[PDB]
Amino acid sequence: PRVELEIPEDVDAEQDHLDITVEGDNGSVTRRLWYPDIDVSVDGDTVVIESDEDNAKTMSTIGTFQSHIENMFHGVTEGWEYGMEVFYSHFPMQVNVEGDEVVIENFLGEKAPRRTTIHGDTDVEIDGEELTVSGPDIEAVGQTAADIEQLTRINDKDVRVFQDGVYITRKP
Amino acid sequence: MEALGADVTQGLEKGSLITCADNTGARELKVISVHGYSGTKNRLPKAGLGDKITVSVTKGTPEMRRQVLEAVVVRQRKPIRRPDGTRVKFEDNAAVIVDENEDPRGTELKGPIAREVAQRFGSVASAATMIV
Amino acid sequence: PQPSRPRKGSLGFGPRKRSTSETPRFNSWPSDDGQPGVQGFAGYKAGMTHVVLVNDEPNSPREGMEETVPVTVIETPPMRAVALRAYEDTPYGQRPLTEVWTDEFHSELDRTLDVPEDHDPDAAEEQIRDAHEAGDLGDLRLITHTVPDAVPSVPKKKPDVMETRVGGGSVSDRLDHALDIVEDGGEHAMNDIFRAGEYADVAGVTKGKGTQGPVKRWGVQKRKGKHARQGWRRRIGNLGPWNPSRVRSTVPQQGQTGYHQRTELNKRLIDIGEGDEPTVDGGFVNYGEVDGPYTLVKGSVPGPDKRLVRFRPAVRPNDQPRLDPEVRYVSNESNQG
Amino acid sequence: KPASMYRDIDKPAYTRREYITGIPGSKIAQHKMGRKQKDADDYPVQISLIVEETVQLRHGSLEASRLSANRHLIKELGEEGDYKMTLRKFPHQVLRENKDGMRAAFGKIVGTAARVQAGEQLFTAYCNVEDAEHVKEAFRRAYNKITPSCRIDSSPAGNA
Amino acid sequence: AEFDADVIVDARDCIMGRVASQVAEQALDGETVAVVNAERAVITGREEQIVEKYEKRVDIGNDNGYFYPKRPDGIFKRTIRGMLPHKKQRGREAFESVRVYLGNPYDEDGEVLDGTSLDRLSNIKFVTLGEISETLGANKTW
RNA sequence: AGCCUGUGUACCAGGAGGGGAACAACCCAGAGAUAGGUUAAGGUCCCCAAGUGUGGAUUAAGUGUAAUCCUCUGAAGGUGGUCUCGAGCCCUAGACAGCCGGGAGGUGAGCUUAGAAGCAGCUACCCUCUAAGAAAAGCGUAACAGCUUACCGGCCGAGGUU
RNA sequence: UGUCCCAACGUUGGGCCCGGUGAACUGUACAUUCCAGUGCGGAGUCUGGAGACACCCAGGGGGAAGCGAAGACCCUAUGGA
RNA sequence: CGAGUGGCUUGCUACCUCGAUGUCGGUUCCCUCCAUCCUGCCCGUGCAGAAGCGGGCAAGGGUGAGGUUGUUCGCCUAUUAAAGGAGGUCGUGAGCUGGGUUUAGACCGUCGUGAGACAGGUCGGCUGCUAUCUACUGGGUGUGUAGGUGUCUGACAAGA
RNA sequence: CGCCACACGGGGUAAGAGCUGAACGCAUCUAAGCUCGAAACCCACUUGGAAAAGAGACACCGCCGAGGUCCCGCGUACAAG
Numbered sequence A: 001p002r003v004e005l006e007i008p009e010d011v012d013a014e015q016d017h018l019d020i021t022v023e024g025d026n027g028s029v030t031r032r033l034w035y036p037d038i039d040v041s042v043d044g045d046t047v048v049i050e051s052d053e054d055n056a057k058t059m060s061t062i063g064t065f066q067s068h069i070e071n072m073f074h075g076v077t078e079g080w081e082y083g084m085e086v087f088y089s090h091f092p093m094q095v096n097v098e099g100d101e102v103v104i105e106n107f108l109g110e111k112a113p114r115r116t117t118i119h120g121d122t123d124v125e126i127d128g129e130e131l132t133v134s135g136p137d138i139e140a141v142g143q144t145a146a147d148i149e150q151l152t153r154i155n156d157k158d159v160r161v162f163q164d165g166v167y168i169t170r171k172p
Numbered sequence B: 001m002e003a004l005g006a007d008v009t010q011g012l013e014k015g016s017l018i019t020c021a022d023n024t025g026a027r028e029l030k031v032i033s034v035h036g037y038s039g040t041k042n043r044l045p046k047a048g049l050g051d052k053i054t055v056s057v058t059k060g061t062p063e064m065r066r067q068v069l070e071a072v073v074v075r076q077r078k079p080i081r082r083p084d085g086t087r088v089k090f091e092d093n094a095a096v097i098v099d100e101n102e103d104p105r106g107t108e109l110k111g112p113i114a115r116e117v118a119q120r121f122g123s124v125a126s127a128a129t130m131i132v
Numbered sequence C: 001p002q003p004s005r006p007r008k009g010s011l012g013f014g015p016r017k018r019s020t021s022e023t024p025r026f027n028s029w030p031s032d033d034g035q036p037g038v039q040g041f042a043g044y045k046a047g048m049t050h051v052v053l054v055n056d057e058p059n060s061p062r063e064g065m066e067e068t069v070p071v072t073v074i075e076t077p078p079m080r081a082v083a084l085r086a087y088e089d090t091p092y093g094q095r096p097l098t099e100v101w102t103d104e105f106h107s108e109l110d111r112t113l114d115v116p117e118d119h120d121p122d123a124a125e126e127q128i129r130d131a132h133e134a135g136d137l138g139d140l141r142l143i144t145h146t147v148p149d150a151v152p153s154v155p156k157k158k159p160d161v162m163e164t165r166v167g168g169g170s171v172s173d174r175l176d177h178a179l180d181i182v183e184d185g186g187e188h189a190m191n192d193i194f195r196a197g198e199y200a201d202v203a204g205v206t207k208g209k210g211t212q213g214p215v216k217r218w219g220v221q222k223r224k225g226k227h228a229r230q231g232w233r234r235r236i237g238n239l240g241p242w243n244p245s246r247v248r249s250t251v252p253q254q255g256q257t258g259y260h261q262r263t264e265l266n267k268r269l270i271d272i273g274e275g276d277e278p279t280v281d282g283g284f285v286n287y288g289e290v291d292g293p294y295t296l297v298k299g300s301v302p303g304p305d306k307r308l309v310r311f312r313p314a315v316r317p318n319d320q321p322r323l324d325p326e327v328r329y330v331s332n333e334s335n336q337g
Numbered sequence D: 001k002p003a004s005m006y007r008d009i010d011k012p013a014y015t016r017r018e019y020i021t022g023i024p025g026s027k028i029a030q031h032k033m034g035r036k037q038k039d040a041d042d043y044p045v046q047i048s049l050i051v052e053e054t055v056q057l058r059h060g061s062l063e064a065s066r067l068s069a070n071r072h073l074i075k076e077l078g079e080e081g082d083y084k085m086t087l088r089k090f091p092h093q094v095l096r097e098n099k100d101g102m103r104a105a106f107g108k109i110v111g112t113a114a115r116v117q118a119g120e121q122l123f124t125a126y127c128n129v130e131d132a133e134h135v136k137e138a139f140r141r142a143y144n145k146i147t148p149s150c151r152i153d154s155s156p157a158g159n160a
Numbered sequence E: 001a002e003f004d005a006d007v008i009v010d011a012r013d014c015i016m017g018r019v020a021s022q023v024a025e026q027a028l029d030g031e032t033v034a035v036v037n038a039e040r041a042v043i044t045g046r047e048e049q050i051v052e053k054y055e056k057r058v059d060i061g062n063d064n065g066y067f068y069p070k071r072p073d074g075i076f077k078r079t080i081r082g083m084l085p086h087k088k089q090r091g092r093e094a095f096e097s098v099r100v101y102l103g104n105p106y107d108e109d110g111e112v113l114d115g116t117s118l119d120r121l122s123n124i125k126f127v128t129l130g131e132i133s134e135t136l137g138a139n140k141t142w
Numbered sequence F: 001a002g003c004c005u006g007u008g009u010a011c012c013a014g015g016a017g018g019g020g021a022a023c024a025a026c027c028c029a030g031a032g033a034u035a036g037g038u039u040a041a042g043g044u045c046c047c048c049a050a051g052u053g054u055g056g057a058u059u060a061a062g063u064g065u066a067a068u069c070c071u072c073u074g075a076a077g078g079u080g081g082u083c084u085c086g087a088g089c090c091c092u093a094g095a096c097a098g099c100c101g102g103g104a105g106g107u108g109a110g111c112u113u114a115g116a117a118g119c120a121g122c123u124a125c126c127c128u129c130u131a132a133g134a135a136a137a138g139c140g141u142a143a144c145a146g147c148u149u150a151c152c153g154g155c156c157g158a159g160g161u162u
Numbered sequence G: 001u002g003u004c005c006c007a008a009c010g011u012u013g014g015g016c017c018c019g020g021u022g023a024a025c026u027g028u029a030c031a032u033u034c035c036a037g038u039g040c041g042g043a044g045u046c047u048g049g050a051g052a053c054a055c056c057c058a059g060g061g062g063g064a065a066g067c068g069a070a071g072a073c074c075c076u077a078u079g080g081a
Numbered sequence H: 001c002g003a004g005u006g007g008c009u010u011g012c013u014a015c016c017u018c019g020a021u022g023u024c025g026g027u028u029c030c031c032u033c034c035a036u037c038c039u040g041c042c043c044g045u046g047c048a049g050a051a052g053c054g055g056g057c058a059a060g061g062g063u064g065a066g067g068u069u070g071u072u073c074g075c076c077u078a079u080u081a082a083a084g085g086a087g088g089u090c091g092u093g094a095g096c097u098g099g100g101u102u103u104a105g106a107c108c109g110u111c112g113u114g115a116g117a118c119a120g121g122u123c124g125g126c127u128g129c130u131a132u133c134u135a136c137u138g139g140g141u142g143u144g145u146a147g148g149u150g151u152c153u154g155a156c157a158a159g160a
Numbered sequence I: 001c002g003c004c005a006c007a008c009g010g011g012g013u014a015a016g017a018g019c020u021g022a023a024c025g026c027a028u029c030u031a032a033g034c035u036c037g038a039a040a041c042c043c044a045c046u047u048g049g050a051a052a053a054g055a056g057a058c059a060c061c062g063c064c065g066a067g068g069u070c071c072c073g074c075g076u077a078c079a080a081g
């Protein structure tokens, strides 16, 4: 099979080996697209994903490579944004971006601060009780966002009662 | 538990017959177990000054005799070490019968007591005439 | 159902054989954090006494109070870093590249070595720097020896040579730091490396005891009760099951016990001084009188009096340094009585 | 006791009741279920449970599965639903057990079983096109209570 | 150092076993062989299982012993020994006239043997010797 | 049962040699000495003589590389893992899915009931508007409200579904 | 009250080294073995691997189904008492 | 109801040993298995919390002291994080013990005319050997690498 | 029976919690890819270790002389050695 992806005018995509770099006004993203017998090339102004095999396993990945590239096109232009809302019941939770990692303090009344390092060139803007994770690499952003929600994981007690923590409000 | 503030060479064992330093009606005590203690194969469970042991009443009033109560070790013949190096030892081995709240069962504590026992069992401490 | 029980003795210090070198050899070194410096020193065990100290621990309820602490006295005179050995990074691990020596040698170093008569320092230095330029320079350590002659109680004059590592800021800077120390005459002191209050790792070759039975050597039991009177007293039950049909090396057996190398971790340096402040009345039994550069180490140290013991900045300390502890008293009472 | 002891057809046919005595009765309640007054032809759909391997199924097993199948139909079509199921095989083969070691080992009578050759119909239900998925589920529950693997074969019914 | 190898083989991206099989045949033939870039040699299959087999070999042992190598250096040589009657005079002579090296210590580039190459474009399920060695706990000297 | 006890037969016993890792009875094979040659069983990546043989396909589990077997397990049951062959229905008069929009009136149908208005229960389940839209398939409220399902239209565009 | 917790130190005689004296048990052969397998189903010797430079001193006895006794148990014998 | 795994129990068989492979229980000392009792990390809950209950991964470490009984098993007490189960010739008598089974003495009950018997009870009732080989714990002497002194490296190996 | 010392932290995983993501336009933690996550694994730390047959490296001394053994006084060592 073969799928041609017309690259946006704002974008500039280059590929060496199995690594594909996509550059745009919002930044640059590089990914490795490695799978048996699937060749991904840059033909002038269209990325080609093709293979001689048409089996279910191959088709699965060709479809995966497509969405990965499209998402890169979108990231280097419009970008990726996840919204979050910090919520607490009794203990006022302080959330700050310190250095290269969002730090959460006094979670559920804890003395020890919970922290997690931000992935890649992802930006975590905080304004009051709202957070906004953004960047060109959906992989890095989506994870950083998830890491934030996961940072307030609770296994010891009932989640339905103890509902404190940050949460993904808007998904791109 | 809270640090004794003294190194202790346990001088008692499970089965040891000691003195009940109080007016409860129980005169002689028999050590049965040592709270929070777990030994090793063949080792006879050891108890020392500052420990909360389980006891059986060997001698005393028919009422108290044959009962299984908790107690605190107040005195022991085998020495103990203090921060300044000095060793301290008593004329006998003794314990004071205690309840669930670690409050002495009886009203009065006969004979002297170790100061280190105070940091652990206050109600027992603030019931002693002498504290060495 | 036969209660469980941990095995008799550790399998981590074997084989339990006689040590190859009476002089200990560290198989680990501290990290390259601070400024360039030698990562170790040595001395000679003298004996023990107690010291009265002020509680240094901020987390202790006794903080500030008097406290009696056991101490081993070790005569630690100046040593001499006679050479700079550079290792190169090869596909088979680290390998000695070359050495930079000196001319100023202690009068009695030849009692052990074939002291250099014709050596080219510069060439070696060049080779080391060229290797560094190539990015093949492993680490840098100094060849060091003691001055037993400086310690009267110690009969030997034949110096104990040992290689100590230099951990510094950058490879380029500690290289220079090393070269400098050496050029002078390699003379250095415990003050140069340590400061009272720091934790050191003391390595040493334990007190020898010759051959000993399982009971002493592995801490196995003695036959008990009736069994103790049958003809067996200090011999273990059996050498192993029917199968496997062989005695496993893990069963507690007779052999060389003592005279092994040991590296005790986190030894607090109570005080580094000089003179006779620590010497015991009537002399340290089986050692002598201490009147010179010394180190007071908290607690015990491996080895017998007169033995060589090595120091090293604790590679895995649990506590934070509590510098220069207050010594309100040092016992000088006789160790006989 | 396990079916492993009686599932194979290796011993001779032991059915002659004129020579065997003390044979336990069959646990099989009844072979004909549903609306037995109505005829099999009065139904558009006919689904049989086909045993894929030649085996011996003990009476407790025939009862255990028949029950679990019909009990489902009663639950889905009602105690008087419009269907009729049939357990066509009967446990003629008498089973022994040597319950002394191998001396005078001829066993004593402990039970009965049905010999089913592979490809045969053990159960056959007749229903109306709507209840066809229920009868298929009854059989899926039934084949879980007998030794062999089975096929749920739909005979007259091309309403898919 | 200095091994007068008649043949220098490059194992980079080559299937270890197949290379090993050919090196043995040549060593028994009298050829002095030097296997090069062993850390970069390859071995197909599901990594997790491959590693399990090698970790088990490291664990297997007793007083008598079972010295199993962890470095790609030794692993490749042991792989080759398994293809030679190393206990026989002729077999030991061959095995000793063969040597594996990390990287390439020679001036010449090693030659890639026929049928030993693995097409990385066509394959995703395989492992590198170094990758196995690092997992085994070997000190990465290469 | 590597059990006990028959029967026919061939073998071991008393049968070498070749193969099977080894191994009385499994395979080839029945064998004077010596010698050249060709095969049998079995095998041809190395160990190890002969293929890293050819055409084609499957498998990603190291499955497997294990004829027979005390010896080599692996079962009922299950599997949108993957490959292949067929049948029925739907589809550029636009299918399947997704997203958007609409899902309306007489009327909150009658009855029951303080109340019940698609949706506690009982009965019926009619006709208008219209391109659709149930006297309502599923949640929801005390009952309403609120949320989707049926059904229609739109966007999209190629196969889809059983 | 060292039977035990829980072991220590010491004493005498041995043990170890040297001079002198000087046996016995045991021995199909070979034999540096270990893990597995196989085999009359409990192998240092067969098969596959692993390990293994030779000799010597001391040790406590895991294995040689260790050495010692043509099994006392059990059955058999047209045995004995 | 149906399908299995294990090889701890019991039974079956009679392949191995009757020119002997020393018993049960215990002890001591070593290794292992996981079907996990505790401890680490998890999922569900009839999960508010606390205390639990059920399940998953996981064998690193731990899993102890006592009263009756020869007992294994088991019953019981107090402690405990918990006081898990099992394999190694039912690990371990050229290691120990010798209370039980099972010699010769004796008694009681039952049976027998009797000698005498008992899948009944009871008291007493022996533990051989100087290690040749192999195995391992430790100690030396030589040879190989191919003049010496001193310092190291680290393939690998052990650890809880 | 007394006294001293005996981590943490990294890396990769299991069960599990997830991200991006297709086969299957949606959905999906998995199929390719990725972020995490056990007292368990690897490193770290301790002990042994040139007989590692690829039998190692460096430095200096020396080949008519460096160094070693014997001998002598002794032990921080030791059953002989």
Ligand SMILES: [Cl-]
Pocket (backbone or CB within 6 Å): B014, B032, B033, B034, B045, H065, H078, H079
């Ligand atoms: Cl207890």
Ligand SMILES: [Cl-]
Pocket (backbone or CB within 6 Å): C222, C223, C224, C225, C227, C228, H028
């Ligand atoms: Cl004993």
Ligand SMILES: [Cl-]
Pocket (backbone or CB within 6 Å): E060, E061, E062, E063, E064, E065, E066, E067
């Ligand atoms: Cl090993």
Ligand SMILES: [Cl-]
Pocket (backbone or CB within 6 Å): E084, E085, E086, E087, E088, E091
């Ligand atoms: Cl060979």
Ligand SMILES: [Cl-]
Pocket (backbone or CB within 6 Å): A036, E122, E123, E124, E125, E126
């Ligand atoms: Cl692949």
Ligand SMILES: [Cl-]
Pocket (backbone or CB within 6 Å): F030
């Ligand atoms: Cl013939």
Ligand SMILES: [Cl-]
Pocket (backbone or CB within 6 Å): E053, F062
């Ligand atoms: Cl494999």
Ligand SMILES: [K+]
Pocket (backbone or CB within 6 Å): H017, H018
């Ligand atoms: K016998």
Ligand SMILES: [Mg+2]
Pocket (backbone or CB within 6 Å): A156, A157
């Ligand atoms: Mg809770």
Ligand SMILES: [Mg+2]
Pocket (backbone or CB within 6 Å): B041, B042
């Ligand atoms: Mg005991």
Ligand SMILES: [Mg+2]
Pocket (backbone or CB within 6 Å): C230
């Ligand atoms: Mg005796």
Ligand SMILES: [Mg+2]
Pocket (backbone or CB within 6 Å): C334, C335, C336, C337
């Ligand atoms: Mg003294």
Ligand SMILES: [Mg+2]
Pocket (backbone or CB within 6 Å): C337
């Ligand atoms: Mg005094």
Ligand SMILES: [Mg+2]
Pocket (backbone or CB within 6 Å): F013
């Ligand atoms: Mg015959």
Ligand SMILES: [Mg+2]
Pocket (backbone or CB within 6 Å): none
């Ligand atoms: Mg060939």
Ligand SMILES: [Mg+2]
Pocket (backbone or CB within 6 Å): none
């Ligand atoms: Mg397999």
